[PDB]
Amino acid sequence: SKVVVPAQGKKITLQNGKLNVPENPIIPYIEGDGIGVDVTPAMLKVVDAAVEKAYKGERKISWMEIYTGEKSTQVYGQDVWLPAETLDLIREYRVAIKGPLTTPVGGGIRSLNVALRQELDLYICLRPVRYYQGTPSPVKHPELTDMVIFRENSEDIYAGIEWKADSADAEKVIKFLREEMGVKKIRFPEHCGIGIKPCSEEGTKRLVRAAIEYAIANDRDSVTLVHMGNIMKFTEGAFKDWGYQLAREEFGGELIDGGPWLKVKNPNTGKEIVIKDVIADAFLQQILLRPAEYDVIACMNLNGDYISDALAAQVGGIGIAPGANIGDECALFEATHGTAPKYAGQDKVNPGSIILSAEMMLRHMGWTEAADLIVKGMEGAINAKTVTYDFERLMDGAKLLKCSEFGDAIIENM
Amino acid sequence: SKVVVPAQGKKITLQNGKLNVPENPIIPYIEGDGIGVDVTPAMLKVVDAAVEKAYKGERKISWMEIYTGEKSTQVYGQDVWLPAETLDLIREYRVAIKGPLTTPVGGGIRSLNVALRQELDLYICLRPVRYYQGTPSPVKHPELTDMVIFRENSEDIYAGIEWKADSADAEKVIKFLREEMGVKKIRFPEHCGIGIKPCSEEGTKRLVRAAIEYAIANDRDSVTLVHMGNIMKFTEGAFKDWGYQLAREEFGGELIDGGPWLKVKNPNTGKEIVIKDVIADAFLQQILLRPAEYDVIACMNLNGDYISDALAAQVGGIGIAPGANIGDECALFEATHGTAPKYAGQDKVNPGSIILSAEMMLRHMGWTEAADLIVKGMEGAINAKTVTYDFERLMDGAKLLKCSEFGDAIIENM
């Protein structure tokens, strides 16, 4: 019911782990709640422009609206926050894009962002953060940050295995812990809440396999594994050891000096990719202090969340950091920010994060000329100092532009 | 066996939740491994100076060496990393100080820092981070950071309840989760590692009671509760709700506008302490971007670890951030950094973090004139630009001083 398939357009298809992409492809998009009604029109107008320019008129995306979040209840019953349908059309048309989603409070429904990521097994959350010349930054030297994050999306504490304090189930599990497993380290068991953090071999190796394979494809200098593993030996300490095992076994890694770090062969280039580890709290500090020593990061779901958001802040963008959730069978590109409902409908917020995730969506389909064009576009709009509220409270002599007008400034510069 | 009690000195005593502190008190100190052999001589020389000056000769600390870490095996059997004795002498003499401790790898022995913190129920880890005028910083505006962290120390994932992947126990607990509790959200159960994160009411309220009581004592503007609670409803989401319940019930909190944030009465001053919440990933960004809006932070063990280390980096100090572990019955002041064994014995490392934790130790005994004197001392040593390797690679026209020589520069300036 209510999604209308367009007339002209063909579905993308998978053949030999590679995508066959039509000249006229169907790409679904979820508009988003709150500021989604503003940034999703800017993204469609500028992607459309960037492929009319790049392929001088021969390719054209056919856009199809699908639903999640608040707009879905409007469209069906107030009861439904993620229609079973949406999950099928992201896997069928293989590549889709989304704006922001908030979830109802308390009321059973778990973060919709993670319902989608987990129900479609999008196990790689990829978050590249680089500096755009001319962005107001908090830090002194932000040009030294050019990092790419592979945050694991299927596991960690972020899975949602938790029981309410004084639940009949919470008491069921703490009794099992004290009686059957000999756990003395629980300080207060009466009125206590419990969560489970799982970490496995086949889940941490599929994420670090993609992170090393991406360093090889893009001629990157190092892969850092971050983990708070001196305290959590068997979940984060295990992920450090299992990621090293994999660079030894599937990628032929070899010892530097005498440890712990390894050296890996680029087959396409013969350069030497270093594989290292930093414990995550020291890493949080390492990213402000010695940022050029780090490049590709591989980490678990909660660590990757905090590191990404921190790195995005460092370089000047809570609001223009691109995102992708990727799996073997499909992919979803998303805006990374909140719904921000106070400033919604008014067209003043920044569309940068959703536009730069449409860039990431275009590089993945293999349309790199239209994507390099959307980044030529963003570097000029900003060099020319013409920008949105969030970059103008911060600087001198910038001209203030609305959200629909800033997309038109991206087209001007490509 | 081997700790020698000094001849002149009396033990500190507790009476009515307050300390009775002798003119000639006994304070134990654990030297530390690695750079501990260098920074612990600087701390003793400068504290001794700061009380000969302040009390013109009438008070004198009697220091007593107790043991943990590497030096303990030297002193007893190679088998013992934390002698049962040490735990008794910290609780008996009530206030003690430590240098850094590393733990043996793998080999059963859990992080010695947390064995001490957990076995002595030091449930408040207090970490104040402020900027010292003239420190090389990564960020543009570091003077805006003056924060104090109450990291909870008894719980969270940081407790150490974890089982090896493919352990007989790990399979015991995942079978209980799938069969008896109906857990479907575990992506890969074969070859999977598990950890438990507990969060309770009597544990989160004793930590937030201290954080509000400290804001009242020191005339602070706000108390922020950080939690990644939109994803972890029942451990971190529970700690947000339980900390609000406590400012309503024991401190008379009242609603601002209409939520969620509260307003609390200062009885000593009638000013208005705001109680707010930020979800932890956005907080990590909020600390770089709007740092003046935050003051006292209350958070769980893993969150408090990452936030502290990040805040310490922001302002210019991985290596001069003070620390205290506090409980109802005793307290331990510590250096926050690693053992750094490469640079050990050579006397080149910074002694700032252990000295500034001896400051914190002196304010707690109630000797505030000797403590204000140790901070007059550090602000001048740095204004005068005379400093250690770690602050000299970073700046212009500084004179290079060794570690024992930098303590002598702190005495000069008080």
Curated annotation (Swiss-Prot), chains A, B:
Checking InterPro entries in the record gives: IsoCit/isopropylmalate_DH_CS, Isocitrate_DH_NADP_dimer_prok, IsoPropMal-DH-like_dom
Q: Site annotation (Critical for catalysis): which residues?
A: 158, 228
Q: How does activity depend on pH?
A: Optimum pH is 7-9. Exhibits maximum stability at pH 6.
Co-factor: note: Binds 1 Mg(2+) or Mn(2+) ion per subunit. Both Mn(2+) and Mg(2+) can be used, but Mn(2+) is 10-fold more effective than Mg(2+) in vitro at the same concentration.
EC assignment: the record states: 1.1.1.42
Q: Its domain of life?
A: Bacteria
Q: Positions modified as Phosphoserine? A: 111
Q: Can you summarize the PTM annotation of this record?
A: Phosphorylation state of this enzyme is controlled by isocitrate dehydrogenase kinase/phosphatase (AceK). Succinylation probably inhibits enzymatic activity.
Q: Its Gene Ontology biological processes? A: electron transport chain; glyoxylate cycle; response to oxidative stress; tricarboxylic acid cycle
One GO molecular-function entry: magnesium ion binding
Q: Which residues bind D-threo-isocitrate?
A: 111, 113, 117, 127, 151
UniProt note on regulation of activity: Inhibition of this enzyme by phosphorylation regulates the branch point between the Krebs cycle and the glyoxylate bypass, which is an alternate route that accumulates carbon for biosynthesis when acetate is the sole carbon source for growth.
Q: Which residues bind Mg(2+)?
A: 305
**Reactions performed catalytically:** D-threo-isocitrate + NADP(+) = 2-oxoglutarate + CO2 + NADPH
- Binding-site residues for Mn(2+), renumbered to this chain: 305, 309
Which residues, renumbered to this chain, carry the PTM N6-succinyllysine?
98, 240
- Pfam families assigned: Iso_dh (PF00180)
- Name what cofactor the protein needs: Mg(2+); Mn(2+)
Q: How does it assemble?
A: Homodimer.
The UniProt family comment states: Belongs to the isocitrate and isopropylmalate dehydrogenases family.
What function does this protein fulfil? Catalyzes the oxidative decarboxylation of isocitrate to 2-oxoglutarate and carbon dioxide with the concomitant reduction of NADP(+).
Record-given protein name: Isocitrate dehydrogenase [NADP]
Organism for this UniProt entry: Escherichia coli (strain K12)
